[PDB]
Design a binder for this molecule. Structure first.
Ligand SMILES: CC/C=C\C[C@H]1C(=O)CC[C@@H]1CC(=O)O
Ligand SMILES: O=C(O)CCC(=O)C(=O)O
Ligand SMILES: [Fe+3]
Length: 338
């Protein structure tokens, strides 16, 4: 219900001209900090691409899609509307301050540990589905178009997710609607988190967002179209992702890794910052209905591939990152049954 300490808005620090980086934002030396990602042309519906998509989801846990049915002007309007929101004076969003029991609104940290290291970012969080959680009053207000751009952007990415779910299912040799079934059909969950990474006086000591995999089903990520910062990890190597114009990055989430009995892997990512420019990225979360007990699909279980995770609802699961904040992939790996 409350934070262990008052919230410092990272924008307030960058708007000062601090000579140093506060120790709360200095990461251990062990964890202190752009390559092309092959793109998938989506208006192609059993191609070589189906092998590539499945190859990406199994070894990397992410892929980049172009020609996906979302308007490029809508993609940019979503970014610039949110960028305008974060360019507002800090005290203009303070009334939207979020709290740890729903996290909805204007936030600057994730987790409730009092001494915990912090990330160099502010963010906004809101729900889109289910409808009893959707509330325009908990949305921003200043950019007069922002709520209409959020609603349509959310509508378009819900549609895109349903189509992506069909490719993910088929690539596992399942009925093309098996994932949509496991998530709860049409009453799935959809939320949005927009991340603001202001300039950082010593970015080689800081992280815009510490390592983690997304707890939910899949993430549709719209990274900043101008500034690099997103990094994915492949076998202890942190690789900076060069964004492709008006493409999305599709992230396998923790919930799909569990459903695929670890055939699909959830990507581990982090954000680096820099001293000279900011970043704005949009994270759309497509999640299973939160009271459905999630477990490895029975279709993928043999006696030599037994189910690797016990059942757990997404309501129970999401509290791990809500209480601890980013902890890499230790949340899902501590979920592997003994
Ligand atoms: C680092 C971004 C990952 C997850 C975003 C998290 C928030 O920002 C608050 C809630 C959300 C997780 C949830 O769906 O419970
Ligand atoms: O800033 C980015 O490009 C990625 C944001 C991110 O990692 C997330 O919140 O899912
Ligand atoms: Fe993320």
């Amino acid at each position: 219900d409350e934070w262990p300490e008052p919230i410092v808005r990272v924008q307030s620090l960058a708007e000062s001209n601090l000579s140093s980086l506060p120790d709360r934002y200095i990461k251990p030396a062990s964890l202190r900090p752009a390559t092309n990602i092959p793109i998938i042309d989506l208006e192609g519906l059993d191609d070589v691409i189906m092998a590539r998509i499945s190859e990406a989801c199994r070894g990397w846990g992410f892929f980049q899609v172009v020609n996906h049915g979302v308007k490029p002007e809508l993609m940019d309007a979503a970014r610039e509307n949110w960028r305008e929101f974060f360019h507002m004076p800090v005290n203009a969003k303070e009334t939207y301050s979020n709290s740890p029991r729903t996290y909805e609104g204007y936030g600057s940290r994730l987790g409730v540990e009092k001494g915990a290291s912090l990330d160099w970012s502010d963010y906004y969080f809101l729900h889109l589905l289910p409808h009893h959680l959707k509330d325009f009053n908990k949305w921003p207000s200043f950019p007069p178009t922002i709520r209409e751009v959020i609603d349509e952007y959310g509508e378009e990415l819900v549609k895109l997710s349903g189509r992506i779910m069909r490719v993910l299912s088929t690539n596992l040799g399942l009925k093309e609607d098996k994932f949509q079934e496991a998530f709860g059909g049409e009453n799935i969950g959809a939320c949005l988190r927009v991340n603001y990474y202001p300039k950082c006086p010593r970015p080689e000591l800081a992280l815009g967002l510490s390592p983690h995999s997304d707890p939910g089903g899949m993430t549709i990520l719209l990274p900043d179209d101008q500034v690099f910062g997103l990094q994915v990890r492949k076998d202890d190597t942190w690789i900076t992702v060069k964004p492709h114009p008006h493409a999305f990055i599709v992230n396998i989430g923790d919930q799909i890794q569990i459903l695929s009995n670890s055939t699909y892997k959830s990507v581990e990512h982090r954000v680096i910052v820099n001293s000279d420019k900011e970043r704005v990225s949009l994270a759309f979360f497509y999640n299973p209905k939160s009271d459905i007990p999630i477990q490895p699909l029975q279709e993928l279980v043999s006696t030599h591939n037994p189910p690797l995770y016990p059942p757990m609802t997404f309501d129970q699961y999401r509290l791990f990152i809500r209480t601890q904040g980013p902890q890499g992939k230790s949340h899902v790996e501590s979920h592997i049954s003994p």
